């Protein structure tokens, strides 16, 4: 465990959970809302928590990412380590569909159904921060 940044290979954005529950990315490394905490619920699954607001990254039923005040089943992701030290993160509540956490090249969140293995959108490199 520990405070990580999750760097998105697609446009070079840190995954950001804004206080209003909005999920996007920024290039600004000083941003308060890119500090995350990963917690292994079981072996395969992780929660990804903002260490600024205590919000947990979540995916709703339409594949939209949001920050959730309190850890429901929408907040659990499977962390699979990949080819290049980059991880991907699959929704649990929708694993069967292969909904990934992803960001677009402009830093916008990419809704789960538009993700697909092999895309740069879905690849996040965990970086110990400070
Ligand atoms: O893998 S791709 O470079 O095709 C990609 C395109 C795109 O428009 C959004 C995310 C992506 O990973």
Swiss-Prot record:
**Protein name, please?**
Fibroblast growth factor 1
| Range of the intact protein held here | 24 to 153 of 155
**Any one Gene Ontology BP term:** anatomical structure morphogenesis
Is Acetylation set as a keyword in this record?
Answer: yes
Let me know which tissues express this protein, per UniProt. Answer: Predominantly expressed in kidney and brain. Detected at much lower levels in heart and skeletal muscle.
Q: Which GO terms describe its molecular function?
A: fibroblast growth factor receptor binding; growth factor activity; heparin binding; integrin binding; S100 protein binding
Q: Which gene encodes it?
A: FGF1
Describe, as the record does, how this protein assembles with itself and its partners. Monomer. Homodimer. Interacts with FGFR1, FGFR2, FGFR3 and FGFR4. Affinity between fibroblast growth factors (FGFs) and their receptors is increased by heparan sulfate glycosaminoglycans that function as coreceptors. Found in a complex with FGFBP1, FGF1 and FGF2. Interacts with FGFBP1. Part of a Cu(2+)-dependent multiprotein aggregate containing FGF1, S100A13 and SYT1. Interacts with SYT1. Interacts with S100A13. Interacts with LRRC59. Interacts with CSNKA, CSNKB and FIBP. While binding with LRRC59, CSNKA and FIBP seem mutually exclusive, CSNKB and FIBP may cooperatively interact with FGF1.
Tell me the outcome of changing residue 79 to A. Answer: No effect on integrin-binding. No effect on integrin- and heparin-binding, loss of FGFR1-binding, defective in inducing FGF1 signaling, cell proliferation and cell migration
Q: Which species is the source of this protein?
A: Homo sapiens
């Amino acid at each position: 465990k520990k405070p990580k940044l999750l760097y998105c290979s697609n446009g070079g954005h840190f995954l950001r959970i804004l206080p209003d529950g909005t999920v996007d990315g920024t290039r600004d490394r000083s941003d308060q809302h890119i500090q995350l905490q990963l917690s292994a619920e079981s072996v395969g699954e992780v929660y990804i928590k903002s260490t600024e607001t205590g919000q947990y990254l979540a995916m709703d039923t339409d594949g939209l990412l949001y920050g959730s005040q309190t850890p429901n089943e929408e907040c659990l992701f499977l962390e699979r380590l990949e080819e290049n030290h980059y991880n991907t993160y699959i929704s649990k509540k929708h694993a069967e569909k292969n909904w990934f956490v992803g960001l677009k090249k402009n830093g916008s969140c990419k809704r789960g159904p538009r993700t697909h293995y092999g895309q740069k959108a879905i690849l996040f490199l965990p970086l110990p921060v400070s």
